Design a protein around this ligand. Structure first.
Ligand SMILES: C[C@]12CC[C@H]3[C@@H](CCC4=CC(=O)CC[C@@]43C)[C@@H]1CC[C@@H]2OC(=O)CCC(=O)O
Ligand SMILES: C[C@]12CC[C@H]3[C@@H](CCC4=CC(=O)CC[C@@]43C)[C@@H]1CC[C@@H]2OC(=O)CCC(=O)O
Ligand SMILES: C[C@]12CC[C@H]3[C@@H](CCC4=CC(=O)CC[C@@]43C)[C@@H]1CC[C@@H]2OC(=O)CCC(=O)O
Lengths: 111, 112
């Protein structure tokens, strides 16, 4: 199954740059690399401002840089502006999803 | 039918804030407000960095502010990083799309 890692994923400050890496992804496919938090069970609010992506190489691997924030203006997948999200108490993680919502499990990060 | 407007939409500069307004929208529905450019027939590369949204009110109306860029990192609807889009030569516009791709037609914008 698809895996992902965020290094470093702890002791992060606002504006910190981390490396997001995916493995066991499908070659050639694009995966949205983004910061998020579940404002409801199974319902994620993300940060498009610093969003980015990645296309798994022939071995289904890829990594990139992501700028994380302690707090960010979160939007839902349906486009709705949810509101400001403070990762200080919210369980923010870095997601890796393709255009159909598939990919590895979100990686918990903390500040 | 849904309709959109961008003011200003001419003589714009990198960093300019414009008013994007939608009408004839589904009351209660959210619509992404974003800058884009067609890099191919029916294929747009958007600017997520300054992306924003709106949620139509009871009368299917809604507006908000959007910061525009002369240049930006473009992304395709499927998540692909396309490349740098330069609105100096690219026909850039402003989109208003719901989670299903529905919404008014793109509004053409231009820079100085
Ligand atoms: C209340 C809550 C933690 C605080 C979250 C809230 C969702 C809304 C929310 C957004 C923020 O950015 C601030 C924290 C916060 C208000 C979460 C919904 C369920 C959750 O509960 C837990 O922490 C789960 C307990 C556990 O760790 O097992
Ligand atoms: C593309 C997507 C909606 C747009 C999301 C994307 C995750 C990355 C992302 C972060 C943002 O803050 C902007 C929107 C966006 C680019 C989501 C991953 C799956 C999702 O789609 C769905 O809700 C599921 C579609 C379905 O299979 O019905
Ligand atoms: C949601 C969407 C993909 C994600 C796009 C969104 C437009 C706004 C936008 C700007 C970005 O730069 C991030 C992705 C994103 C948030 C698109 C509008 C329609 C599109 O999806 C479809 O083609 C619709 C497929 C379907 O019928 O489910």
């Amino acid at each position: 199954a698809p895996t992902a890692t965020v290094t470093p994923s702890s002791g992060l400050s606002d504006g910190t740059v981390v490396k997001v890496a995916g493995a066991g992804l499908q070659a050639g496919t694009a995966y949205w690399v983004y910061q998020r938090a579940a404002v409801d069970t199974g319902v994620h609010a993300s940060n498009p401002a610093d969003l980015s992506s990645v296309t798994a190489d022939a071995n289904g691997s890829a990594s990139t840089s992501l700028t994380v924030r302690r707090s960010f203006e979160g939007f839902l997948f349906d486009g709705t502006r949810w509101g400001t999200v403070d990762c200080t108490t919210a369980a923010c993680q870095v997601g890796l999803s393709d255009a159909a919502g598939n990919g590895p499990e979100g990686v918990a990060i903390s500040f």
